[PDB]
Amino acid sequence: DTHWELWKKTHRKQYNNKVDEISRRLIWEKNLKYISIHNLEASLGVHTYELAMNHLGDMTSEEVVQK
Amino acid sequence: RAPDSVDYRKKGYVTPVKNQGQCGSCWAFSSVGALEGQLKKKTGKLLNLSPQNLVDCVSENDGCGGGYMTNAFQYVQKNRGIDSEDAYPYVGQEESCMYNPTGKAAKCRGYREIPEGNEKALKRAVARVGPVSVAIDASLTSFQFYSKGVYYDESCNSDNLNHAVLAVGYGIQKGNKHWIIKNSWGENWGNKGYILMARNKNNACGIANLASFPKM
Ligand SMILES: *C(=N)N(CC(=O)N(C)Cc1ccccc1)NC(=O)OC(C)(C)C
Numbered sequence: 090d091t092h093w094e095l096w097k098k099t100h101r102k103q104y105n106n107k108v109d110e111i112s113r114r115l116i117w118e119k120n121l122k123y124i125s126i127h128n129l130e131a132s133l134g135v136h137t138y139e140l141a142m143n144h145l146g147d148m149t150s151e152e153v154v155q156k
Numbered sequence: 157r158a159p160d161s162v163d164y165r166k167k168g169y170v171t172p173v174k175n176q177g178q179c180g181s182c183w184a185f186s187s188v189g190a191l192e193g194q195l196k197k198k199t200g201k202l203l204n205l206s207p208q209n210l211v212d213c214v215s216e217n218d219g220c221g222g223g224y225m226t227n228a229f230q231y232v233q234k235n236r237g238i239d240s241e242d243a244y245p246y247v248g249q250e251e252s253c254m255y256n257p258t259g260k261a262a263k264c265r266g267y268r269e270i271p272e273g274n275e276k277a278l279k280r281a282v283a284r285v286g287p288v289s290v291a292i293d294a295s296l297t298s299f300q301f302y303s304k305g306v307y308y309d310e311s312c313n314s315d316n317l318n319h320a321v322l323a324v325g326y327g328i329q330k331g332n333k334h335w336i337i338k339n340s341w342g343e344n345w346g347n348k349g350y351i352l353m354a355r356n357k358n359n360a361c362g363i364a365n366l367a368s369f370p371k372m
């Protein structure tokens with residue numbers, strides 16, 4: 090997909106094989122969906138803050154601060 | 157009257173946002189940021205101190221495997237100095253302690269700990285001393301993708317400290333009190349590498365649970 094390719098190129102992402110890349114693409118798709126919902130909720134006064142996709146889009150929140 | 161607000165970025169106490177990368181050196185970035193603030197306050201000069209010096213040389217910490225800001229300050233003291241970024245650059249992986257006294261940019265005569273969970277004491281420290289090293293729960297997706305506004309997530313665990321950052325001030329936005337927090341995940345995270353974290357919301361993310369600063 091054009092967006093996934095541009096994301097990987099921009100953040101210089103590399104994967105070890107097709108399974109690893111698809112598994113990381115799946116986490117990224119789930120994070121995009123999370124961001125969209127939270128921001129909708131923020132537009133309705135549910136949150137005092139908003140979110141955006143960044144270089145950590147293909148990781149779990151736990152992975153970011155663990156291993 | 158004027159609001160009770162502080163932002164040390166406006167006084168040139170704060171260096172630009174760094175990127176720790178794929179290394180668990182958040183504590184080293186937090187430590188140098190606190191040291192940078194005090195060096196500016198003492199000598200009037202603002203320069204990048206070496207996180208890599210702390211990663212490669214603080215034996216009581218684990219370089220890319222985590223550590224404490226207090227242990228970093230104690231090393232700088234016992235070592236009678238820390239080098240600049242220029243004399244000891246960041247490579248984002250631990251190596252052997254190539255500390256060089258010729259590149260010394262700062263010293264430390266001890267450190268201070270804010271009383272556990274006391275946000276008012278943290279506030280007074282930031283107001284009177286300058287940037288203060290703090291630890292938080294950074295483990296939520298809400299933090300991972302933070303972009304703008306005042307970060308307040310009730311799921312955030314103050315008994316689960318896993319990340320070190322720098323409190324460079326405090327204020328209020330849209331009636332929400334905040335801490336001005338400098339992160340070490342580069343300028344592509346947050347608001348150009350910064351996050352506003354909720355202030356006086358029952359010690360949200362443990363912001364005042366493990367807060368410390370160097371004496372210079
Ligand atoms: C920050 N870079 N950092 C290290 C890290 O993320 N590790 C090693 C994972 C981890 C940290 C804390 C608890 C469990 C796992 N964080 C860090 O050093 O955190 C403190 C709380 C300052 C030790």
Ligand SMILES: [Mg+2]
Pocket residue numbers: 149150151295296297
């Ligand atoms: Mg999560």
